């Protein structure tokens, strides 16, 4: 099948390049640019700021272009500067001169990754229902492409921490290739505003601010709470990646059947089910008395991504007009998720020193669980009452 294999490999090489960036970036500020941990807490503070004006902006374009590949050409274009840009540019620019200067160059990302990954999901999702395949399939490539790269940052990470990057930049042109050969064949922004008054959006978004925002904040300190469960910080962390590397293959496998499970259960129960494993993981983390537990727990993450990613599209397409699938994705499951993730992540911090972890997480469960349970009724569609 023409589109399936091209855009399936597209996810493979796209998320491979998140590979270099995702778990490696903090290291490359940490070690290779000797920047201080007191400076990297601002860099992230900017990479998100820009994204806040790229994510909605990418949503309207990703619909107005429809199946036109122009917006995905820009991304594949910017991704090619992976290699010259950190080596050539993002490297010298904040060291000799005030970081505040190079911090802007950080916008690179905001564009490519934080606000560009979901634009790749959404676009390939639209193609996913003009060809004959399921979005969960092919998207499953993302996990294995992230797993493949995930194993390589650490291994050559101590022999040539410039190839990981260089390797990523190379895959960007492979990404240009697959974008070209693949062959694939509305609204106005004032009709787009109509959705923001429609009360069916405020319920879906509510679910995101409630369940998904709470989940993506939690999974923020988790690591710091997992390392404490092994002897030495290095032995503890070492085990972590292994969980991440190994559990993503399950996730990819889980995603493989995901769309079959998703297609009948229906969209709403897909999100409710996703909300449940996120809720259980939030409250479960509080009751921790052993690692073999904090491992399991990290694995559930792979049990909640399949449904969520696949499920949200089934929801958005099923209950909303498809003339807005990219927009209400990049505004609800991305924009509104990140906008609220500024604020909790504050709150969580205060809770720790106020109620440590145990006491904090416990709260997340009720909040995450409460909202999950509430969205059996705020979300329109068929609840779990049907089966």
């Amino acid at each position: 099948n023409t589109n399936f294999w091209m855009f399936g490999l597209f996810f493979f090489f796209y998320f491979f390049i998140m590979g270099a960036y995702f778990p490696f970036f903090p290291i490359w500020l940490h070690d290779i640019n000797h920047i201080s941990k007191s400076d990297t807490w601002i860099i992230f503070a900017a990479i998100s700021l820009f994204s806040l004006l790229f994510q909605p902006l990418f949503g309207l374009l990703s619909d107005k272009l429809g199946l036109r590949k122009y917006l995905l050409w820009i991304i594949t274009g910017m991704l090619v500067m992976f290699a010259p840009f950190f080596i050539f540019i993002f490297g010298p620019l904040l060291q000799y001169n005030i970081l505040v200067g190079s911090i802007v160059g950080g916008i690179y990302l905001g564009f490519c990754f934080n606000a560009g990954a979901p634009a790749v999901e959404a676009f390939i999702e639209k193609v996913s229902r003009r060809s004959n395949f399921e979005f969960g399939r092919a998207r499953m490539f993302g996990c294995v492409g992230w797993a493949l790269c995930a194993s390589i940052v650490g291994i050559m990470f101590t022999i040539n921490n410039q190839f990981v990057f260089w390797l990523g930049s190379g895959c960007a042109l492979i990404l240009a290739v697959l974008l070209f050969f693949a062959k694939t064949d509305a609204f106005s922004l004032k009709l787009a505003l109509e959705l923001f008054r429609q009360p069916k959006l405020w319920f879906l978004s509510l679910y995101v601010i409630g369940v998904s925002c709470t989940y993506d904040v939690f999974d923020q300190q988790f690591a710091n709470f997992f390392t404490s469960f092994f002897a030495t910080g290095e032995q503890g962390t070492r085990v972590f990646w292994y969980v991440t590397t190994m559990g993503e293959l399950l996730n990819a496998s889980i995603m493989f059947f995901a769309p079959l499970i998703i297609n009948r259960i229906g969209g709403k129960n897909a999100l409710l089910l996703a909300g449940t494993i996120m809720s259980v993981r939030i409250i479960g983390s509080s009751f921790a008395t052993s690692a073999l537990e904090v491992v399991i727990l990290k694995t559930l993450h792979m049990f909640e991504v399949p449904f969520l990613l696949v499920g949200c599209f089934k929801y958005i397409t099923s209950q909303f007009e498809v003339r807005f699938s990219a927009t209400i994705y990049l505004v609800c499951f991305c924009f509104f998720k990140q906008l609220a993730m500024i604020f909790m992540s504050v709150l969580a911090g205060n809770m720790y020193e106020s109620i440590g972890f145990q006491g904090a997480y416990l709260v997340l469960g009720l909040v995450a669980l409460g909202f999950t349970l509430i969205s059996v009724f705020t979300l329109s569609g068929p609840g779990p009452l049907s089966l």
Epitope: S228, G236, T237, Y352, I355, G356
Partner: nanobody, 130 residues
């Protein structure tokens, strides 16, 4: 945050004898998620001794002290113990309790890493005779 830990115990003891250290915690009762004993002499550094986690009571001890020491707790009255048997001569050094509670940035620390805990107690020296 200010919770605080108070050690008791320690005294002179003869090679082969016993001691019982206790560590009270004034504030605590939600935060500290894990308690440990660490010791320090001269010559060398802070050395991990034993760790335990309130909820559940799972214990860990750095090899050099297994079977010889027992770390226990008793929530019920904000206190963690170290029962030290078969003492030796090397076993002389200031013993500290420490408790965890909040997180803290870097490449993360584990259950033997001193830098890992968010709080400490003053001390109570322990001298085992030659």
């Amino acid at each position: 945050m200010q919770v605080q830990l108070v050690e008791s115990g320690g005294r002179l003891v003869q090679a082969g004898d016993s001691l019982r250290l206790s560590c009270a915690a004034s504030g605590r009762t939600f935060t500290t998620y894990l308690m440990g004993w660490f010791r320090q002499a001269p010559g060398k550094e802070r050395e991990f001794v034993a760790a335990i986690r309130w909820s559940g009571g799972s214990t860990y001890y750095a090899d050099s002290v297994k079977g010889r020491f027992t770390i226990s707790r008793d929530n019920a009255k904000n206190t963690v113990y170290l029962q030290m048997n078969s003492l030796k001569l090397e076993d002389t050094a200031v013993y500290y309790c420490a408790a965890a509670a909040r997180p803290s940035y870097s490449g993360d620390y584990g259950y033997t890493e001193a830098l890992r805990y968010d709080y400490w107690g003053q001390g109570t020296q322990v001298t085992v005779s030659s």
